[PDB]
Amino acid sequence: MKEKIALFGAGGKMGVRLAKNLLKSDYRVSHVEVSEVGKKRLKDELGLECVSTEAALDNVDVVILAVPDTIIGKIAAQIAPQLRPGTMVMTLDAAAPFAGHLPDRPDLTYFVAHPCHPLIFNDETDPEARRDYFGGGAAKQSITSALMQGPEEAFDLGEAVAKVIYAPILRSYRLTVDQMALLEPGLSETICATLLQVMREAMDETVRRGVPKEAARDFLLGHMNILGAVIFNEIPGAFSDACNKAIEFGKPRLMRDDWIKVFDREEIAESIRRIT
Amino acid sequence: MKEKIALFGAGGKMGVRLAKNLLKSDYRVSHVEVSEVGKKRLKDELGLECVSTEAALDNVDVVILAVPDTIIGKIAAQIAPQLRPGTMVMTLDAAAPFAGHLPDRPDLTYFVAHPCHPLIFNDETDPEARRDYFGGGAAKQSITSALMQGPEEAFDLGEAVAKVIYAPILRSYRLTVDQMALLEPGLSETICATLLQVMREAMDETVRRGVPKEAARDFLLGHMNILGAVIFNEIPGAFSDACNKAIEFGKPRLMRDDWIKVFDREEIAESIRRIT
Ligand SMILES: NC(=O)c1ccc[n+]([C@@H]2O[C@H](COP(=O)([O-])OP(=O)(O)OC[C@H]3O[C@@H](n4cnc5c(N)ncnc54)[C@H](O)[C@@H]3O)[C@@H](O)[C@H]2O)c1
Ligand SMILES: NC(=O)c1ccc[n+]([C@@H]2O[C@H](COP(=O)([O-])OP(=O)(O)OC[C@H]3O[C@@H](n4cnc5c(N)ncnc54)[C@H](O)[C@@H]3O)[C@@H](O)[C@H]2O)c1
Ligand SMILES: [Ca+2]
Ligand SMILES: [Ca+2]
Ligand SMILES: [Zn+2]
Ligand SMILES: [Zn+2]
């Protein structure tokens, strides 16, 4: 038996995934969930019963707040007076921690752990791993963690828990909370999600103009494969002169000249205000 | 034995791939290559000897111009007087045909066939197929073809050849040359290549700012997997409110408001002028 964990939001989207992976470890886990629906999922899918806050917090080592980001501060403030010095409070996302929503408690340990998801270019032999897009099922994924406050020794404990809840694991990285914020919302959402949206809009426009729907989808997804594999150095190669010409003109044609300033601290901080 | 094919540019990047796949069919093929280097590749890799134009064109049914797009017109003009009515001249790209570079010969058949490449989201059981990014090796790919001129019956012949040179095949679509031009340069190069470039630039910027290099790469490529799979309906699901918020603000933050006008005919035509 290892440390005691209290999992709040245990019946939510991340809650049930964590509960499922924690059942396969030696951690002692108490599950806290307010919704009937979530309590039912836990019961039906995992055979787990939920307990009260007081029961969950009794001799707790690690508190995982798998609750929405907009209420991490509120929930942390409710429970913090029950937490002894040296208890770890762990979030699964850097937003609420970055925004300064966690309690003013220098004596607590604050840890964030966010998954990468399985790589788009991967050679999972297991077909079931090839179809695990999210991670935490069969395909390996890298993780990113930050020790925001606490002793250096607590990093190891937080990282161990992270490796269990997100298993199976590829690589495990240590970052700061500021770096985590550059990654998300900055890189994965402001950049990646928006530009995939644009690609889908472009695809839809060629279909509007009469390209068969499935043809446009195959063409885009196949060119994304080869182009992405080269640009991201998954394989050797170099773009043809034609492709470079397209980027040459395509950059100023599509993009605002100041697009990369999304990574400025003021812009990152504002993106986090909007979702907290 | 089936139709006779003359493969020009037989020792180039596409030439050797086509030669390799045509060796596994019943087509009778003559190979024409001007460079010593290319003649050597054919000889060494495939055991094939090259022949003269005159020999290659004698009783030819299909001429494949696997030569650079900037000289398809010139090369087609050189050889066209040797081609009898009803001979197919086939290109592997829509650019030179769209630009009107092919000879003024109403009596010839003009056919374009361009591959999709293997889909970025695929469940190839064969690991060797999982690592074929380009296509024409082990992984299946969809193809797009156009009969630009000639009788309806010639489509079938062109498509058969296309299925052999690009094998193995997923789906085979029939398009117009105008539609092919929307797909490339429009969708795959002006859009897709440019936006992957932007994603790589963003990734590089988070590394400049201190994110570990491999962490940034894993994070981006893993989020591309899950986000792309949802946006392109490879799996069910819907973006969280946070992710939608990022796109909401991200679209006007990153993109020129007129970006989708790249698909206007004038812009497509100009993109093709630059590469022909
Ligand atoms: N969904 C994702 O893809 C994803 C990926 C990585 C990280 N995360 C992070 O996971 C965390 C949770 O997100 P989610 O998507 O699972 O949210 P969710 O809305 O699906 O689940 C939240 C759960 O918290 C419960 N809850 C609300 N108030 C509570 C309380 N006072 N006490 C106990 N439980 C309470 C809800 O009833 C619900 O079951 C967030 O920090 C989010 O950013 C989410
Ligand atoms: N490379 C790609 O990824 C790709 C993908 C799909 C389609 N295509 C299309 O394939 C065609 C050929 O492109 P490539 O990348 O193979 O080019 P390449 O430059 O690699 O090969 C061209 C070959 O043509 C030969 N050649 C030049 N002049 C010739 C002549 N007068 N007679 C005979 N041979 C001659 C060259 O010596 C060379 O070996 C183009 O239409 C291109 O758009 C290329
Ligand atoms: Ca987030
Ligand atoms: Ca092209
Ligand atoms: Zn994320
Ligand atoms: Zn292409």
From Swiss-Prot, chains A, B:
Record keywords: Carbohydrate metabolism, Metal-binding, NAD, Nucleotide-binding, Oxidoreductase, Plasmid, Zinc
One of the record's GO molecular function terms: prephenate dehydrogenase (NAD+) activity
Pfam families given in the database record: F420_oxidored, PGDH_C
Pathway membership: Carbohydrate metabolism
SUPFAM superfamilies: NAD(P)-binding Rossmann-fold domains
Source organism superkingdom: Bacteria
Annotated Gene3D superfamilies: NAD(P)-binding Rossmann-like Domain (3.40.50.720), Semialdehyde dehydrogenase-like, C-terminal (1.10.3640.10)
GO biological process terms held by the UniProt record: tyrosine biosynthetic process
Swiss-Prot/TrEMBL cofactor(s): Zn(2+)
Annotated binding of Zn(2+), by residue: H114, E184
EC code(s) of this entry: 1.1.1.421
Chemical reaction(s) catalysed: D-apionate + NAD(+) = 3-oxoisoapionate + NADH + H(+)
TM helices/strands, residue ranges: none
UniProt enzyme class: oxidoreductase
InterPro entries tied to this protein: NAD(P)-bd_dom_sf, P5C_Rdtase_cat_N, PGDH_C, Preph/Arog_dehydrog, Semialdehyde_DH-like_C
Ligand binding (NAD(+)): G12, K13, M14, E33, D69
Similarity section: Belongs to the ApnO family.
Function statement: Involved in catabolism of D-apiose. Catalyzes the conversion of D-apionate to 3-oxo-isoapionate.
Name of the protein: D-apionate oxidoisomerase
